[PDB]
Amino acid sequence: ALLERILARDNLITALKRVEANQGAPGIDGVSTDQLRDYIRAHWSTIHAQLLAGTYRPAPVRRVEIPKPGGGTRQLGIPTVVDRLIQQAILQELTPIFDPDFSSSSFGFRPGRNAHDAVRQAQGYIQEGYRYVVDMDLEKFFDRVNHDILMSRVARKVKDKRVLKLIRAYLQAGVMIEGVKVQTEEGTPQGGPLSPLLANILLDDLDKELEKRGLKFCRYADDCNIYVKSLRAGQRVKQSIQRFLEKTLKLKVNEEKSAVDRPWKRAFLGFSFTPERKARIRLAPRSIQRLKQRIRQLTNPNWSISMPERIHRVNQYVMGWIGYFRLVETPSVLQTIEGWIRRRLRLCQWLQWKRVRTRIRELRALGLKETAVMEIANTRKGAWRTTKTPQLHQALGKTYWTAQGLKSLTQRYFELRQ
DNA sequence: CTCCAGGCAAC
RNA sequence: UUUGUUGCCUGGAG
Numbered sequence: 001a002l003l004e005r006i007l008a009r010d011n012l013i014t015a016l017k018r019v020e021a022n023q024g025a026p027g028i029d030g031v032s033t034d035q036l037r038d039y040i041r042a043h044w045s046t047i048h049a050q051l052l053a054g055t056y057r058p059a060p061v062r063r064v065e066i067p068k069p070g071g072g073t074r075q076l077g078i079p080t081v082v083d084r085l086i087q088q089a090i091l092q093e094l095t096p097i098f099d100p101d102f103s104s105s106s107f108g109f110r111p112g113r114n115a116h117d118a119v120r121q122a123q124g125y126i127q128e129g130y131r132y133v134v135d136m137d138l139e140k141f142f143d144r145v146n147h148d149i150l151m152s153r154v155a156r157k158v159k160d161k162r163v164l165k166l167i168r169a170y171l172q173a174g175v176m177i178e179g180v181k182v183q184t185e186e187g188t189p190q191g192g193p194l195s196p197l198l199a200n201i202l203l204d205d206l207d208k209e210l211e212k213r214g215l216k217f218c219r220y221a222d223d224c225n226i227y228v229k230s231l232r233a234g235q236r237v238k239q240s241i242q243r244f245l246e247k248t249l250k251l252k253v254n255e256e257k258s259a260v261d262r263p264w265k266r267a268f269l270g271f272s273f274t275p276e277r278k279a280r281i282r283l284a285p286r287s288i289q290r291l292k293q294r295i296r297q298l299t300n301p302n303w304s305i306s307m308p309e310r311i312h313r314v315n316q317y318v319m320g321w322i323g324y325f326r327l328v329e330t331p332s333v334l335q336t337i338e339g340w341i342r343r344r345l346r347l348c349q350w351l352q353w354k355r356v357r358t359r360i361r362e363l364r365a366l367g368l369k370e371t372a373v374m375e376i377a378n379t380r381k382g383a384w385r386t387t388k389t390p391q392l393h394q395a396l397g398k399t400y401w402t403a404q405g406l407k408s409l410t411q412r413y414f415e416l417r418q
Numbered sequence: 419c420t421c422c423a424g425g426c427a428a429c
Numbered sequence: 430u431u432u433g434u435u436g437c438c439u440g441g442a443g
């Protein structure tokens with residue numbers, strides 16, 4: 001059966017290689033991903049037989065406080081490298097059980113389904129005429145999943161009694177705070193390999209309820225949004241779905257994140273819209289500011305690495321960042337930020353030549369006319385003031401940086417579009 | 419299509 | 430320090 005299908009050698013080996021490639025910090029027994037192969041070889045005959053007998057209880061998850069981009073504290077649950085391996089072996093077998101019957105409008109944590117599909121369908125509804133959105137998010141979503149309602153939904157397709165006892169055992173296994181087990185009443189661990197799938201199993205009935213209601217929607221994780229023709233119809237369905245998820249699935253709504261507002265005034269998965277009739281996708285103001293804050297720390301303030309290294313470090317971030325944010329339809333702001341990136345990268349190049357004699361030595365070697373070299377080498381202006389001056393743009397502008405190995409932001413934006 | 423070193427994003 | 434999933438991307442062994 002399913003526990004036998006989970007404990008199959010090929011399914012365990014692929015699950016092992018995942019946590020190995022993850023390189024995640026150890027659980028509460030302190031054993032690392034590096035020791036994971038050596039640890040299971042010694043403890044396998046026990047682990048295998050003790051969970052075959054239904055006597056196996058997993059070790060508690062490690063509490064780690066990480067800050068969220070919103071500001072608040074996110075509590076993580078880090079399982080034992082074995083407890084991460086076992087959950088993986090459960091996930092790998094539970095995906096073909098649950099995934100095909102998941103919603104067409106479900107996009108979160110799913111194989112072959114991305115954030116772009118969630119936005120393309122989202123712009124496709126407002127383009128059709130549904131020019132109002134009911135954006136919704138859930139209060140501490142992974143912390144608030146009810147154990148009884150969840151395994152009710154797990155038992156719907158899974159008939160094997162041994163795995164239902166095993167998943168419950170993982171859910172019931174507590175946390176370690178000051179060397180003591182702290183039993184869990186509600187919540188699936190924020191860091192359990194299986195836990196993102198269990199999140200989709202619970203809210204599949206919410207998907208089924210919305211599909212029965214005949215509503216045009218997009219869901220990614222707990223961040224769900226329904227696309228309506230009007231503000232009156234949106235406000236109406238804002239309360240009736242809140243009542244549904246609070247009663248039938250027992251979940252609390254984050255009212256600070258949830259709104260009935262216009263799609264272009266709100267952000268969805270790092271993207272926003274334009275007030276146009278056929279609405280174009282734009283960068284959300286949070287996503288622009290997260291980029292700008294990252295470039296400020298990547299470019300040298302009082303930092304000390306090699307500049308050819310720095311250019312490559314800027315390269316790997318920007319080219320990756322544009323890989324996700326290729327979906328935006330406004331290249332104008334993308335043209336500005338690349339110019340801003342060049343402008344910011346000019347600042348740390350200007351301070352590198354600290355001496356006035358080195359300033360003249362390099363600018364004359366670059367090709368710039370002596371008339372302009374001596375005019376700006378001994379200037380009294382500030383460091384950020386000098387980076388916008390006509391002469392520093394001539395010696396060190398667009399043509400210089402591209403020759404120095406800086407990969408252009410806009411060039412690869414159109415390359416990924418083509 | 420599977421796996422390895424790394425990176426970007428969403429959650 | 431910092432976990433997990435999912436998508437994509439650069440390079441590599443098949």
Ligand SMILES: Nc1ncnc2c1ncn2[C@H]1C[C@H](O)[C@@H](COP(=O)(O)OP(=O)(O)OP(=O)(O)O)O1
Pocket residue numbers: 070072137138139140141142143190191221222223254429432433
């Ligand atoms: N880095 C992560 N690692 C593991 N799980 C994560 C991570 N980020 C998000 N999740 C999971 C747990 C969250 O409950 C769920 C939905 O994300 P999100 O709404 O941002 O957080 P949240 O619901 O815990 O907080 P909030 O109460 O502030 O809305 O996705």
Ligand SMILES: [Mg+2]
Pocket residue numbers: 137138139140141222254
């Ligand atoms: Mg939430």
